[PDB]
Every structure is written in structure tokens, then in C-alpha cells.
Write a structure and sequence with these properties.
This is part of a larger assembly, with chains A (about 280 residues), B (about 200 residues), C (about 230 residues), D (about 15 residues), E (about 80 residues) and F (about 100 residues). In chain A, helix 2 (about 110-140) runs antiparallel to helix 5 (about 200-210) and helix 4 runs parallel beside helix 6 (about 270-285). Chain A is built from 6 helices and 12 strands. In chain A, strands 4-3-7-6-5 form a 5-stranded antiparallel sheet. Chain A has about 280 residues and is an alpha+beta fold. In chain A, about 40% of the residues lie in helices and about 25% in strands. By secondary structure, chain B is an alpha+beta fold. In chain B, strand 6 (about 80-85) and strand 7 form a beta hairpin. In chain B, helix 2 (about 110-125) packs antiparallel against helix 3. By secondary structure, chain E is mostly helical. Chain E has 3 helices and no strands. In chain E, helix 1 runs antiparallel to helix 2. Chain F is an all-alpha fold and about 100 residues long. Chain F has helices at about 1-35, 40-70, 85-95. In chain F, helix 1 (about 1-35) runs antiparallel to helix 2 (about 40-70). The longest helix of chain F has about 35 residues, at about 1-35. Chain F starts with a helix and ends with a helix. The chains are: A alpha+beta (about 280), B alpha+beta (about 200), C alpha+beta (about 230), D mainly alpha (about 15), E mainly alpha (about 80), F mainly alpha (about 100). Chains E and F meet through helix 1, helix 2 and helix 3 of E and helix 1, helix 2 and helix 3 of F. Chain F: One of its GO terms (biological process) is positive regulation of transcription by RNA polymerase II. Chain F: Keywords: Activator, Coiled coil, Nucleus, Transcription, Transcription regulation. Chain F: Belongs to the mediator complex subunit 11 family.
């Protein structure tokens, strides 16, 4: 909003509450039931000082408003909204909580740095959204900005896609290790990463670094024999940060028995079945 | 999901919801809110003595449990395991739930299966046995298609086509037919990693 | 396309003051741009009856093709090592995708507030064949090169589709480049409209711009004869 | 006290 | 808008000084009581003139009032440390 | 700053008005002393009135010159962001990764 400056000097907004949000990281132990607090972001406390403080209040409250407009579309992906100033994120191994409280309510913790980095990534992603509004105002629209929640949603979901993509890559490497590494001797897996307006362009690209989609192609190095040379190359991608898409690219080099099978499965059991069909015929005798 | 109404010259106020039902009326001398249920109906008293937020918040839960109770007697499949209390959905156990603000089905980690699964709920709010059997049809056809070839032009989705001429049925068993340019020939045959060997024997 | 424009003119001294004023009003810095426009007139060697097949009079009009070109072909040797912004203006096989346009005479009406003009436009993507040059294409359609002018200036992006073009215009010839806007900058304020309510609303936007800029720079309405590209 | 006054106006009506 | 401050301010100065001289020339010469209240009213008009000068000077004061590598590496270590891959 | 030094000069003009009030109480009070029947407070009287009109004249010269500055400052040094937040998050992030 806009406050009125009067007389030392003081700034009276619309004394006042200190709305500073925080993120805490929970962890599920061997009980496989509830979660425990494993991390929490630290909270730090004449005229320009109140300017920066109130700008942080309106900024973080605006980001919280974007999160409230985000859980309504992330409701089907586990991210449930409960309290008007408290949302929860459910994971099969962990759990997140985003609260907007003051300093009146509520160390051996370990995930204290991951929460800080997560919040800094929240504010940075919001700045990226602002740059997408300015860039989405200077060139094309020739008037006002046109945004879509689902399209401008990206804050919490792309962050969840990193952990979920890490778990999907772990289970995928487990399936590959059990169906290839535990079958053939010499084998290894190697991952490989897939005018005067230049100021804004530079900014955008650095967050090109933050804004990428987690997609990794796992090349399978099969032991090439003197009579057979099979080729197996998987590619794990995601259609929208979350979800898992396993694209199996198989190129058989066996003499008098060469065929290319490039399939796409989203179920790990189907990956075990297809890889079983590959290793039980083309790879082995 | 919320529509308000305020009536004058009769002294009554109405609140309507479940727009994707529950009547507030004053016809004696007190405001009452009678909430309907599937083959049932109960009453909630209204004035400060009763929070509108708590009553309207719990009614959707109590009737929501009955909505979850209809699915057990509507049309549940054998392989499709469902549990109302925290809708356990086993095709892989997937967390199913019903949206409170709308009434559609939500699954944990969606897929194409859950886009077509959710399209039936998006239309009508149980012919989903049919859609389920169609999906279970689709998967096997994807495997047999990637292994073999599949061509759709003259046959119906009730039985796949392989290409003389070949065909394979799912409801009845390998069948050998020939087509004109109208079926001309028809013979039946009974058959049994094993699927790979079977496909290698088919040729 | 119905373009509603209001023009103006400033000097070489108030350029920074107008850039600062429009920067404080629009809230955005200016964007440097340029464009080359070539005008093709009917071939004088060819003679055709100015009449359609339906026995209707036809008025000959010129065809203007415009495109873009980076500043690497515009900056010479004495212009190197300078900021690429609005302060530069004070120091003054196939074919490219051309922009074919034909402008008509503005509408009549005394005491008019805006200058509405009908302009037809088609996009020339590319070409091929023997005579693949755009000049040979215009000669095939029945037009020859008359003149051309290259304009370099700055533009703003406000609201409701308003454009403020503060540009200079030069005539590209072989004997030399003569500056038409020698002594100042040409100002423009046009909106491109594809309804009566939207036209009157655009006129309301232009009148609000002239009222907001009243006192500083005056935005009058140009003469119709000054925007008529018909051949006589 | 004005909204209650209008409340009584629409009440007696 | 400054010419109104020229004419107005200068008029307040001329009324202040000239009215002060008229004051002192009327303090030195029911007529006596009318002199009492004429002198007192001249004094109060001088006070209102000084206050007017203060208001006008206050209006004058109100007129005076009215890179990419560090981000790629920083976010790289931030994501790698965040997910603990 | 410009408006800071000029604002201090305006405050100096206001203190010159206060001095004008001192010389006003002095011309009226010492004038009343002259009208009681005393003539020995005459030189300090004339000096206080001369300082009255002198301080007033200096207020006119400095004030009118100030208004001339207002007229000659229009357009020049007088009117007729997420970047700092991004850099703040970058410096804070670097402070997290490097304590």
C-alpha cells in the first residue's frame, strides 16, 4: 500500500504486526506415520529502516498471497492448503509447512540451511515473476500484462519436482542396477545433463539456471562382446517438473538380430518388465 | 459453490451450495437448516448459538462420507479396490480423494490414466467400469504394438488388428481371418517373458 | 487497419527534457529503433486505363514496403564506443521479409480531433525463382522504385495501444543523405485499431494525451493532403 | 447506527 | 505562479512597513480610545503580516519538496545443497 | 544537498524574521521609553530601527533571490525497484553459502 509520513519521524501504515513468514522442514523417521521438525529458517529483526522493513512485509505477504493462489491449483499434487496463513506440503518421505506468523507464536536441527536456501529461492522466483511481468509488458502486449495462475504458478511445484525427481532417479537407478548391473559384470551408468533491453535478458538467463526442467538421460554402457554389441539408453524426463516419464531407447547391435525399440512408460513396473524383456533376450544368450 | 439469498416481506434467508441441496428456511418462528443425505435428511438449528462456519463446514463432511458410501454399492470392480475412509484406490495403491469444493476425483501423482480416469468425473458427477476395462485394454495393446503391426481402419476397438490378415480378440483365443477390399474367412484357435515367446511362435 | 495518429515536432535542445518527461509519465525508458521504407510508384513507361472490370474508377496509389535493419550497418567509425541508448540520436539469394502497405487519404470532417487513416498491409515472407529480387518482383507487379527514406528514433509503450515515435528521417540517395527533420525530432502518437465504441475510446485516449501534454508540446492534426500518397 | 436504521427500514417494509 | 508571490509578498512587505510607520505616527498623536484600538489593530495586522510571511515561506519550502556466473554458480550450489543429491 | 543547503538558507531567512521581531519589540519598547520623557535611549533606538529595516531589506533580497532560484530551477534539478531486492537475495544467498 502507501503509508503517510509524519513526525523523530515515524511511518504509520494501515504499532503494527511483523508479518514475516518462515519455512520449516520435517522428516519422517522409521515409524512411517508422523513427521518431526528437522529444520527452520532463522528470523532476523531510521526512516529507510522502516522503509526496507515494511517493503519486506508487503513483499513476503504478496509472496504468501501467490502461494495461496498456488495451492488452489496444487491441491491435486499433495500440496494442501489448511489455514489462511499456513499451508502444508505432503511427500512420501518428508513434509513441508509454510506459515505466515509474527514473533509471538513459537539447536540440534540439521535442515536449517535448506530452509533458508528454499526461502531465498522463493523470493528469487518471485523476482523472476516480476521480470516476466515487465518483459511481459515492454514488448508484446502493448498495454497491460496478461498472466495465468497455472502458467505463472511456478514457485513451489518446480521445487517439489527436484526432490521428487531425485527420488524417481534413485528408484530408476535401483531398477537399472538390479536388472543390468546385477546381471552383466562390467557395466556402469553415466548421467549427462540434457538493442537496449539486454539488462533484462541477462537477468532472465541467470535464472535460466534456476528455471530449468529436471530432465536427465541415463546412458547404459553394456559390455560389448566380440559377436554382440547391444545398446541401452534410458531418458528420465518430466512433462511439468513433477511426474515421471521414463523413455526407454534401445538399439540392438546383435548380428543378424538388430532392432530398435524406443518406448515410453510412466510406471516403474512396466520399466522392469520392458528391461526384463531386453536383458532376457538381446543382452543375454 | 456458494450462492446467497436474502428474502424480504416474509422474513427468511437462504444459503445454497453443493452447486457442483441444503435449505435454510424460517417457516415457524426460528431459522432452521435441514441438510439432505442419500435416502436421509437431518436438521441443524440456527439463530451465535451455532457457528454457521462450523455447521456448513461439517455438513459437507457428513454428507461427503455418504457420497463416498454410494460408490461401494454403485459399481465397483474386483481388481479396483476402494476404501471410503481415506479413499484407498488400488488398480498400485494410489491415494484417491473427493474434492470438497467441487466433487471430482483426485489421485496422488497423476498420469494419462488419471486424465482419462478424471474425464468421466469431469463430465458426469457408474459407467467407469467400462472406461477402466478400456484402459486395461489399451495397455496390452501398447505392448503388443511395440513388440510387433497394429493398424486401425476396418476393425472396432473391441478387438485389435494385426497386419493375408490377422486379428486378436479380448472378450472371447487367437482368431485367423481374411478381409475383402467384409469378412470372408474365420477360424478359431486356442493358445496359452512368455508373451515374447508366444509372439515369436505366432509368425 | 484504422490508425489514429497525432504528430508533433521538437528541437535538438529539448530532447532530454521530452525523454525525461515521457519517461516519468509512461514509467518506462525509451526503446531505440529504426526502419527503412521504400516507395514504389506505377511505371511511367506502362499505360493502363484507370478502371476496374466492373466499370468503376480507380485511383492510382503508391505502395510502401518497410523493413528493419540492425544498427551495425548504421554506426560508422566515429560512432563506436558509445552507449546503445537514446543519446545516439543527438550525434546525428532470396529477399528479406518486406512489409507491403498502401495508405489511403484520411477521412473528412471539419474540426476533427484525430487523424484516422486506412492502410492495407500484407507480409512478404520470401521469394525464389530467376527474378527473386524484390525490385524485380515490384517490376513484375507493375511498380518501379521512386524514393526511399530511413528513419531512426525512439518509441514508448503506454496503455491502450498508444505509440509515441520520436524519430528523425533521412533520405537515402547516391548523391548524399539529406536530413528532412534537420533541427529537431518528429513526434508521433498513433494507435492501431482493427467498432464505433473502440474508435471513440481511442479518440478519448488521444485527447487525454493531448490534454496531459498541454502546455509542453502541442499535438495538432496534420493536413489530409500531407498524408495522401496518390499519384497525380 | 445507520446500518441498523436501514435494517429497521427494510424490516418494517 | 511565482509572480503571485512577487506581487503578494511585496504587498505584504509594503503594508507591514508603511503600516508600521503609520502606526508610530498615530501612537505619537473618545478620540484617545479610538487611537488605542486603531494602534492595537495596526499591531495585530503587523502580526498577521509576519504570520503571512511565514506561511508564504512555508509554501516556498513545499514548492522545494514537490554477474551471470555468480548467479549460475550460486544457484548451482544452492540447488545441490538444497536437494542433497 | 541542494534542497538541504537552500532549505537551511530559508531557515536562516526565518531567523531573520525572528530578528525582525526582536527589532520590532525594541522599536516599540524603546520608542515607549522615548515617549516616557527620556532621550538617552535614542542612539540605541535609531540603531535598532536601522537594523530593523536592514535585516528586513536583506530578507527581501535573499527571499526574492530565492524565488528567482525557484524560477530558474524548473526543468533542471526540479520535477515540474526489484533490482535491489534481487541483489539483496544474491548477497544474502552468498552469505548463507559462505558464512
Amino acid at each position: 500500500d502507501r503509508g503517510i509520513a509524519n513526525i523523530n519521524l515515524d511511518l504509520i501504515p494501515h504499532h503494527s504486526v511483523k508479518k514475516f513468514l518462515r519455512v520449516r522442514i520435517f522428516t519422517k523417521i522409521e515409524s512411517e506415520d508422523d513427521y518431526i521438525l528437522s529444520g527452520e529458517s532463522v528470523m532476523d529483526r531510521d526512516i529507510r529502516k522502516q522503509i526496507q522493513l515494511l517493503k519486506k512485509i508487503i513483499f513476503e505477504k504478496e509472496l504468501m498471497y501467490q502461494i495461496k493462489k498456488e495451492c488452489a491449483l496444487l491441491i491435486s499434487y499433495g500440496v494442501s492448503i489448511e489455514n489462511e496463513n499456513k499451508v502444508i506440503i505432503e511427500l512420501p518421505n518428508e513434509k513441508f509447512e509454510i506459515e505466515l506468523l509474527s514473533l509471538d507464536d513459537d539447536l540440534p536441527k540439521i535442515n536449517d540451511k535448506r530452509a533458508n536456501l528454499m526461502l531465498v529461492m522463493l523470493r528469487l522466483l518471485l523476482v523472476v515473476i516480476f521480470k516476466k511481468t515487465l518483459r511481459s509488458r515492454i514488448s508484446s502486449p502493448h498495454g497491460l500484462i496478461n498472466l495465468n495462475v497455472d502458467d505463472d504458478i511456478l514457485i513451489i511445484r518446480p521445487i517439489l519436482g527436484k526432490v521428487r525427481f531425485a527420488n524417481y532417479k534413485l528408484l530408476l537407478k535401483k531398477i537399472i542396477k538390479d536388472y543390468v548391473l546385477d546381471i552383466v559384470p562390467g557395466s556402469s551408468i553415466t548421467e549427462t545433463e540434457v538493442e537496449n533491453i539486454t539488462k533484462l535478458n541477462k537477468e532472465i538467463r541467470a535464472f535460466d539456471k534456476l528455471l530449468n526442467i529436471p530432465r536427465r538421460e541415463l546412458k547404459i554402457n553394456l559390455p560389448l562382446t566380440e559377436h554382440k554389441s547391444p545398446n541401452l539408453s534410458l531418458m528420465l524426463e518430466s512433462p511439468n517438473y513433477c511426474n515421471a516419464l521414463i523413455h526407454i531407447k534401445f538399439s540392438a547391435g546383435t548380428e543378424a538380430n538388430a532392432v530398435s525399440f524406443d518406448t515410453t512408460f510412466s510406471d516403474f513396473k512396466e520399466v522392469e518388465d520392458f528391461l526384463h524383456f531386453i536383458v532376457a533376450e538381446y543382452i543375454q544368450q | 459453490n456458494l450462492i446467497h439469498n436474502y428474502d424480504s416481506k416474509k422474513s427468511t434467508i437462504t444459503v445454497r451450495y453443493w452447486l457442483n441441496t441444503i435449505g435454510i428456511q424460517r417457516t415457524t418462528e426460528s431459522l432452521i437448516l435441514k441438510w439432505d443425505n442419500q435416502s436421509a435428511s437431518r436438521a441443524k438449528n440456527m439463530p451465535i448459538v451455532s457457528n454457521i462456519e462450523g455447521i456448513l463446514d461439517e455438513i459437507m463432511f457428513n454428507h461427503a462420507r455418504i457420497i463416498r458410501s454410494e460408490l461401494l454399492a454403485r459399481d465397483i470392480f474386483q481388481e479396483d479396490e476402494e476404501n471410503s475412509d481415506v479413499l484407498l484406490f488400488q488398480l498400485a495403491p494410489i491415494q484417491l480423494k473427493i474434492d470438497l469444493l467441487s466433487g471430482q476425483f483426485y489421485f496422488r501423482n497423476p498420469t494419462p490414466l488419471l486424465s482419462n480416469y478424471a474425464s468421466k468425473i469431469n463430465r458426469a458427477e457408474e459407467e467407469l467400469a467400462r472406461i477402466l476395462q478400456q484402459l486395461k485394454l489399451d495397455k496390452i495393446i501398447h505392448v503388443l504394438t511395440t513388440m510387433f503391426s497394429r493398424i486401425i481402419k476396418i476393425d472396432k476397438p473391441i478387438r485389435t488388428q494385426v497386419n493375408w490378415y490377422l486379428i486378436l480378440s479380448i472378450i472371447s483365443c487367437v482368431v485367423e481371418k481374411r478381409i475383402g477390399k467384409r469378412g470372408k474367412w474365420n477360424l478359431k484357435y486356442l493358445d496359452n517373458q512368455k508373451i515374447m515367446i508366444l509372439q515369436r511362435t505366432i509368425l | 487497419v484504422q490508425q489514429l495518429s497525432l504528430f508533433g515536432s521538437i528541437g535538438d535542445d529539448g530532447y532530454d527534457l521530452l525523454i525525461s518527461t515521457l519517461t516519468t509519465i509512461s514509467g518506462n525508458p525509451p526503446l531505440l529503433y529504426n526502419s527503412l521504407c521504400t516507395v514504389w510508384k506505377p511505371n511511367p513507361s506502362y499505360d493502363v486505363e484507370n478502371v476496374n472490370s466492373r466499370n468503376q474508377l480507380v485511383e492510382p496509389n503508391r505502395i510502401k514496403l518497410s523493413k528493419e535493419v540492425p544498427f551495425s550497418y548504421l554506426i560508422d567509425e566515429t560512432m563506436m564506443d558509445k552507449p546503445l541508448n537514446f543519446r545516439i540520436l543527438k550525434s546525428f539469394e532470396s529477399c528479406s521479409p518486406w512489409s507491403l502497405q498502401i495508405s489511403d487519404i484520411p477521412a473528412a470532417g471539419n474540426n476533427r480531433s484525430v487523424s484516422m487513416q486506412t492502410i492495407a498491409e500484407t507480409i512478404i515472407l520470401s521469394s525464389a525463382g530467376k527474378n527473386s529480387s524484390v525490385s524485380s518482383l515490384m517490376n513484375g507487379l507493375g511498380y518501379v522504385f521512386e524514393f526511399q527514406y530511413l528513419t531512426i528514433g525512439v518509441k514508448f509503450f503506454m496503455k491502450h495501444g498508444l505509440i509515441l515515435e520520436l524519430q528523425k528521417i533521412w533520405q537515402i540517395e547516391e548523391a548524399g543523405n539529406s536530413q528532412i527533420t534537420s533541427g529537431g525530432f518528429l513526434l508521433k502518437a498513433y494507435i492501431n485499431v482493427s467498432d464505433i465504441d473502440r474508435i471513440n475510446y481511442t479518440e478519448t485516449a488521444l485527447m487525454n494525451l493531448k490534454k496531459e501534454l498541454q502546455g509542453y508540446i502541442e499535438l495538432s492534426v496534420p493536413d489530409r493532403q500531407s498524408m495522401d500518397s496518390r499519384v497525380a | 447506527t445507520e446500518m441498523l436504521d436501514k435494517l429497521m427500514v427494510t424490516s418494517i417494509r | 505562479s511565482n509572480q503571485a508571490l512577487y506581487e503578494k509578498l511585496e504587498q505584504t512587505r509594503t503594508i507591514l512597513s508603511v503600516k508600521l510607520a503609520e502606526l508610530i505616527n498615530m501612537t505619537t498623536i473618545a478620540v484617545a480610545t479610538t487611537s488605542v484600538m486603531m494602534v492595537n489593530n495596526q499591531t495585530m495586522q503587523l502580526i498577521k503580516n509576519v504570520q503571512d510571511l511565514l506561511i508564504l515561506t512555508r509554501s516556498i519550502k513545499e514548492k522545494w519538496l514537490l554477474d551471470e556466473k555468480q548467479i549460475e554458480e550460486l544457484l548451482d550450489n544452492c540447488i545441490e545443497t538444497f536437494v542433497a543429491e | 544537498p541542494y534542497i538541504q543547503e537552500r532549505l537551511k538558507s530559508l531557515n536562516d531567512i526565518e531567523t531573520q524574521l525572528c530578528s525582525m521581531l526582536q527589532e520590532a519589540s525594541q522599536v516599540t519598547f524603546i520608542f515607549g521609553e522615548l515617549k516616557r520623557g527620556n532621550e538617552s535611549v535614542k542612539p540605541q533606538f535609531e540603531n535598532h530601527v536601522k537594523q530593523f529595516y536592514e535585516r528586513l531589506d536583506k530578507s527581501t533580497t535573499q527571499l526574492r533571490k530565492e524565488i528567482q532560484l525557484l524560477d530558474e530551477n524548473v526543468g533542471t534539478r526540479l520535477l515540474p525497484q526489484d533490482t535491489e531486492k534481487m541483489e539483496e537475495q544474491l548477497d544474502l544467498l552468498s552469505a548463507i553459502l559462505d558464512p
